[PDB]
Write a protein that binds this ligand. Sequence first.
Ligand SMILES: CCCCCCCCCCCCCCCCCC(=O)O[C@@H](COC(=O)CCCCCCCCCCCCCCC)COP(=O)(O)OC[C@H](O)CO
Ligand SMILES: CCCCCCCCCCCCCCCCCC(=O)O[C@@H](COC(=O)CCCCCCCCCCCCCCC)COP(=O)(O)OC[C@H](O)CO
Lengths: 802, 802
Amino acid sequence: RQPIGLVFTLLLFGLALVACYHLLREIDPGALHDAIADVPRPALLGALSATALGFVILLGYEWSASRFAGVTLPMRSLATGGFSAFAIGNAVGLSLLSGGSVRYRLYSRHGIGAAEIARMTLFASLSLGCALPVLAALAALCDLDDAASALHLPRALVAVIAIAVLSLAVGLVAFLARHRLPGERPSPDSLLVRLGRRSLRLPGLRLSLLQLLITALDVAAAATVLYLLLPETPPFAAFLLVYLLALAAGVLSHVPGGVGVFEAVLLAAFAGQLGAAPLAAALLLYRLIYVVLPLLLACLLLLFLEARRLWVTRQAIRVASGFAAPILAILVFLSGVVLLFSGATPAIDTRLEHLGFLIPHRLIDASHLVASLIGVLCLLLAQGLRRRLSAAWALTLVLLLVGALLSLLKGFDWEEASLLSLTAALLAMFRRSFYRPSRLMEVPFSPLYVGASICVVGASVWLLLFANQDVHYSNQLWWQFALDADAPRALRAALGSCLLLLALALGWLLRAAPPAIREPNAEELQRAARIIRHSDQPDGGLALTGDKALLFHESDDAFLMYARRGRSMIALYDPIGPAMQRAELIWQFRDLCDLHHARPVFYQVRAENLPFYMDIGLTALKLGEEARVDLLRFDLENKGKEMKDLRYTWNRGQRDGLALEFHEPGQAPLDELKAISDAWLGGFSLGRFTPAYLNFFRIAIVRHQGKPVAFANLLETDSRELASLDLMRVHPDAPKLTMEFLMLGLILHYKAQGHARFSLGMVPLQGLRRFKDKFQPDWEPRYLAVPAGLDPLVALADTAAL
Amino acid sequence: RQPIGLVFTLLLFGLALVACYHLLREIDPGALHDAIADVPRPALLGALSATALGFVILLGYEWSASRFAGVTLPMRSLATGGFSAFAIGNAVGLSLLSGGSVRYRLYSRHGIGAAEIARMTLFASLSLGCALPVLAALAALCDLDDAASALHLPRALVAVIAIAVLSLAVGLVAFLARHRLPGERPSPDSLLVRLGRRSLRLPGLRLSLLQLLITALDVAAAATVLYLLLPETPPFAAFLLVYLLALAAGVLSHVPGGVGVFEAVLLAAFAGQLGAAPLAAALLLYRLIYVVLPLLLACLLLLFLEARRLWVTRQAIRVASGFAAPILAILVFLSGVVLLFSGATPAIDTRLEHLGFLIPHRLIDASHLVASLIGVLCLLLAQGLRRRLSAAWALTLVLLLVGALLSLLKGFDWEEASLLSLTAALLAMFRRSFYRPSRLMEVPFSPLYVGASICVVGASVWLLLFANQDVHYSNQLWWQFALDADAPRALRAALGSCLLLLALALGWLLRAAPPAIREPNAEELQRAARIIRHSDQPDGGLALTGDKALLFHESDDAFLMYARRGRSMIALYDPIGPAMQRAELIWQFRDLCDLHHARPVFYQVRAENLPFYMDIGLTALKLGEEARVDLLRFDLENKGKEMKDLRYTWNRGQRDGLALEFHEPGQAPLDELKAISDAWLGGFSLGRFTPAYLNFFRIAIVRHQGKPVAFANLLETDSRELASLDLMRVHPDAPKLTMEFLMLGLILHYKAQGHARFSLGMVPLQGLRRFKDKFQPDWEPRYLAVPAGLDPLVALADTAAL
Ligand SMILES: CCCCCCCCCCCCCCCCCC(=O)O[C@@H](COC(=O)CCCCCCCCCCCCCCC)COP(=O)(O)OC[C@H](O)CO
Ligand SMILES: CCCCCCCCCCCCCCCCCC(=O)O[C@@H](COC(=O)CCCCCCCCCCCCCCC)COP(=O)(O)OC[C@H](O)CO
């Protein structure tokens, strides 16, 4: 899927480049520059305003999603989320930090469910995805002659196509209206439809109409931006029609920005009618104003919020797994783009002639080549920054500033140097955000980033051909070292960048295979047990069963237990140790998973570590509820119906002759345990009955008039914060209150030693819930972490099987 | 002492500046530049060669010290040490990284004693310090007329002065030869002299003569360097005489480089005879070639060795407390100097006229001012880098590269930008060397660094006056913003730098006083005990006595116990916890000590942490020996006279009716303990007898036929690595073998539980040594850490009193 989808997009981009080259054959860069300069100031200020209007309409797009999913949020929060998600989706879609991710990051602070957000994003996407053809047909129906002229098709054909589209639209609307279940409504604005297999959620009539108006206003404003930039204006209907088609074509192409394809379509539509140069200039200004500008605004906004949050709340925020690393990766990538493009384009003559005196002539050529290499390194270090490396942050901070220096020593291009330096400032300001002390060579291969790198290099070479089209091909251009000669510098640069990218890509591809997963040995198990003791978490006990492999921190202070199942690696709980060790461990696991081409999954995680999973790109699903009784409040001289039932149970148990005794680890009656375990059997998160496992923990045994009837090992630490029990077996013939006596006896015993809390157990998603509730415990949600895209049930079913 | 010595040096520098200003009044920068250009290539290549010759002779200087102190080292090591110590001493003497420090760092890897190195340095210093006047007199005796003309004094006066000096020299030599103790000789080349109070160590005749030849060749080569640079050459005798005097005057002035004063004296000597401009040019080239160049070579050498050591030995080196932070602090300081000086000097007209087109005219003035501020910040962040901060490393890495950018946007001064960038490269390459995550605002005030900052600012202003001496004073110069106007830019720069330095200096001086030292409370004590348990070191037990204050790491994982005594804070042992926590703690202590204006001292430290103390500027003295028995090798069925004596003791003890029993912490007979403690009493590193202290540890009591006779608390951890005993009391009336039975019983008991090692105790600097040796233990040295300068006995005596 991943390589196929990459290759498909890459080829589509490549084709669109070739199309644009063969379409702008007549135009030379001089003409284009003149066309760009031609545009009047009121037109620019108009487009700059229509951008704002069109982005304010995109807030309503988020409002419709909020209403559909039934999410109550503050208006300031909804606005911020809407703007930032749309801005960053539209520009760098699906490559870095998609709109969904930005929604899910921003809205998880308010404590909205992952399913709700997911639904919001899906609605926001499919809204445009399904309302695009309808608006295209509606626009086509106005002035068929103009539309036919634009598309270069017969009037009859486009007419019947429009009629066929609107007929299919109303037909589907009627069909879903037929299967409308009454009564139940998940939200005020939501219908449920029943087909037979699954119940699907569709918008209501009012919401559907309101979003369709919103979509209409959105695409209108978007098209108007591009309309104002054109000196000569074709009929609005046809223009809008083609814009819609082009937008569609760009989105389907799965090209990050829609660049290459969108421009190809517009140019093909109005190659002759509007000319090439004025259109190309309008397209560039459109892309700079409507895509690039908002993205940079969003980048700065979210950086600002992150910095403000860090400054205000200093103590609570410890590890910093916020919203800086992804933005900085984006800005760094853009920087590398800016370096590579500059390297392709020839310098200004005036700047070169001034510089020629100050700097030696060969240094310029050297500077230029190195600056091109640095550009490619900046492309590939985006991934590093994304994964919160510290090495990557150090290297990138150096390169961005060296690159900014060479940008002044290549042709005194201060516009480049300014941006590179500004980026390097922001990168240095967020120093804490990059903590991981891992090796850069250990970063996994990422097809996507390499794909994007190749695309950018392609676009640089395209720009090289288009810029240096006034020089004849010659073999002597390669060696030609002189000031005025721009084309040699570009050629050298392009070759150097192409070789360096190829080298690094091949080096990453051909690397030593990772070691296979093995079970832990005696030493590892002992270390794991040591870690568990010197910690708060007693749930770590299931590490010692020697059934699931162990990932150890470099400091051997904290560890994480995981097991491979099919194509997905599952981690049993949160990592065991201090917070700073936990974050590094969660990343370490993600790295490992990626190396082995497996989905990372975290089973039964607490709420406190959720943002660390959100970082590495997981989503929290409500798995179950975990009960824990607080022994400080709980006392044997308290009131409450359940409490009176418990004391009655305890008193009867004592009178009947039930005795509970605790055996230290090692000194256990293995014969009696084996007997009861066999009796219970006759009649991953489980805990085996191997003696080795049992000798680690102290076992509480209850006896009924002397004979051993039931037992339950106890997970403990050296601290007296929390205590839990994993394995717990009872004899089928035992009295019904015997298990409850054992259970309450445990609670009282831990009260005696003075443990703050006592972990009862988890209920997923009836009897177990009631039984746990009968002790009057404290409930706490337990989550499941799965990749964000689409893996809701497959992973849960697979884990349930395991 | 510190403020007085600072003010004295600062005033001497100030005066020497004023002297040089009033002496080079006639010369304008044009004439000076012409004088510098005048010097021929053979003269430069001659001076560059005579520098090398003179530095090769400085190796023999180290050789004489090695022989005197009696230190056997490899020739490569001695060479490296000699070169680097002399190079860095001569340039940045006593301000940053003195020659002594560099010797003591480089030679402590081979495992040479601190007393030996100290002696080596003292000899190397005093050699020149005492051989300078003798050579001055010897030179004076040759051609009195020329010497008299040079000094502008009567021939008779200089003659009798020379005669008086040589008479005093031979008189002192005879006087020390009189009190020559025969027989004993610490080294082959060393005499001991007895005056009555203390025995002093003087060189032998052969060594004295050889070093005096070495000193003669050294100063000759040094003077020759400056001789070749002069076009017209005065008589060698007189010239050498004045050079000697000037060198002396510079050294006594305690000016880091000898700059200001040395030049003043030379200029005053040959103001009229040789002219000002040619002499000034010779002096500049001398300073650049003989001082600055070697320093930069040494800086690079030692950086290279550090990098090579890091690359080769990756695993053993963990925390990196090597030789990078001091060098980088030096290079950063030099960078800031280079920025400030450039800012004072006016730009080249050609470069300004080229730049005037590219850059807006006001930007140049802005760039120039900011670059001057950045220069002053680079001055003050040297201290930060020195103290291995990470904040300081991040900030400095940014500033050096921004400063390098502004250096190209001020007057396109690429020579500056190259150096700043090269420094910023090296600083980024040694990223690990700066680990401390402390706040920059928390750095203590340092009079020395501020003193050096003020000096540099002074020298910048001096350069400003001397460079812009072709412009008349006017009030309108401040506001004058134009390209060609250089003097306004310099004036603004100088003012901006002066205000920023004043502001920061005052801000550091006026700061909230540090909190006073308090005793630990119940919570702190409990935390300390927790830390001790989850650790290897059982010696941490004496923390719990609640007698000495506790410094806790930010992570509350490791801590360090210290107590103030008079004017020196003593830390009781190494910090307790992991290595990474230990380094930060040792620094944290140094910070604290500096805040309270107290000498840091570390009492009883192990060898493994020595380099962490060496970093913060301490020296290890051999305090005593600590015995520890290894229970793995030791067994009850072994052979050896001492072992047979032990088993005989054990068997007799058992037969007599001595019984040893171990009581858990809390469950102890306090009555019996109090009784025995009182009986023993009747008849900081001590351990009190307060019940609170005793309830923490398990007490071993021995009984003689039922009655309690002796006891000894046991320091333990949860691990079974090491065990120790602090407090140990016996009844006066007890049998002589009873204490030995208790002692051997402990050893056997710990064998039973299976503890690897068992700490016996320390003997400082007779009976105790024999008693410990009778168990056949393993000896390990125990050190004392005291400030490097001169605090050998005062601290030890003060600690002994406490
Ligand atoms: C050729 C145009 C018409 C064809 C339309 C379709 C083509 C589709 C396929 C090709 C994709 C577009 C290729 C062209 C890109 C822009 C080319 C360009 O103009 O590049 C300039 C330089 O390249 C760029 O500026 C490209 C930037 C593109 C990306 C924009 C990102 C901006 C933000 C970066 C991060 C900022 C960080 C700080 C703030 C957070 C060089 O021209 P100049 O005259 O402006 O400069 C001359 C000299 O070299 C220097 O002055
Ligand atoms: C005035 C000389 C005669 C008087 C002698 C006695 C005076 C004593 C009191 C004053 C002390 C000396 C003051 C003069 C310093 C040098 C002045 C100078 O020439 O400064 C130049 C610039 O300042 C310096 O270069 C000063 C450097 C001094 C320190 C040297 C350190 C070098 C190493 C730094 C670290 C390197 C890092 C990388 C390698 C590890 C500016 O002149 P320029 O024509 O060379 O340049 C013009 C334009 O501004 C730029 O080209």
